[PDB]
Design a protein around this ligand. Structure first.
Ligand SMILES: NC(=O)c1ccc[n+]([C@@H]2O[C@H](COP(=O)([O-])OP(=O)(O)OC[C@H]3O[C@@H](n4cnc5c(N)ncnc54)[C@H](OP(=O)(O)O)[C@@H]3O)[C@@H](O)[C@H]2O)c1
Ligand SMILES: Nc1nc(=O)c2nc(CNc3ccc(C(=O)N[C@@H](CCC(=O)O)C(=O)O)cc3)cnc2[nH]1
Length: 161
């Protein structure tokens, strides 16, 4: 199975503050849905709680070592090894974070689905320093700020080298 990680980072690799996203770009969230629909998504307990419910059309796998932790509609696993197994016989698995999971999986990541948001904001969670490794961009698309999305952002699909 291909190990991919998807995230949206503001400048300085910021991805969150107070267990929430420091911005609101509905069109970017639709890009997230587009990139994960039909695929198993693996996330940390904090990220699952920030989302507030399982995401439709995807196998929701949540990581937590609290043995009695079991929200409705999601599969809970106690280790990353169990998350992969839980994903099943699929072609690609999507690590949807949070910083904790990105950190642990970066070294093993095959692809990074990154959205760079042109914004400098306060944060308490950051995406790992992926540039310490070698990647080659496979796809990209720039999205100018608009009516319902007040920030410019750029999508970049990186493949590990
Ligand atoms: N902008 C983006 O693209 C994006 C994406 C995702 C998340 N976020 C943001 O990032 C923040 C959440 O991430 P964060 O790191 O605080 O939390 P997190 O990574 O989502 O979750 C951390 C928790 O996951 C469990 N866990 C971690 N590693 C584990 C392992 N190896 N085995 C079993 N369980 C493990 C532990 O919970 P237990 O104590 O229950 O074991 C750990 O406390 C929020 O602000 C969220 O909004 C942003
Ligand atoms: N590219 C990217 N953008 C993000 O916002 C993002 N967010 C997370 C974690 N936070 C969230 C927060 C909300 C939803 C969410 O509600 N997603 C819906 C679409 C939006 C909606 O239905 O309101 C989904 O069906 O995926 C997903 C992840 C993880 N990776 C990301 N990756």
């Amino acid at each position: 199975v291909i190990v991919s990680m998807i995230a949206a980072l503001a400048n300085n690799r910021v991805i969150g503050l107070d267990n929430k996203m420091p911005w609101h770009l509905p069109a970017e969230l639709q890009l997230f849905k587009r990139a994960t629909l039909g695929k198993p998504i693996v996330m940390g307990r904090n990220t699952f709680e920030s989302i507030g419910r399982p995401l439709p059309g995807r196998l929701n796998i949540v990581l937590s070592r609290q043995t009695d932790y079991q929200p409705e509609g999601v599969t809970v696993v106690a280790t990353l090894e169990d998350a992969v197994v839980a994903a099943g016989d699929v072609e690609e698995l999507m690590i949807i974070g949070g910083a904790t999971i990105y950190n642990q999986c970066l070294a093993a990541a095959d692809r990074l689905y990154l959205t760079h948001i042109e914004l400098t904001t306060e944060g308490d969670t950051w995406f790992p320093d992926y540039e310490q490794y070698n990647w080659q961009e496979i796809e990209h698309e720039s999205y100018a700020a608009d009516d319902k999305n007040p920030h410019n952002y750029r999508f970049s699909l990186l493949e590990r080298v």
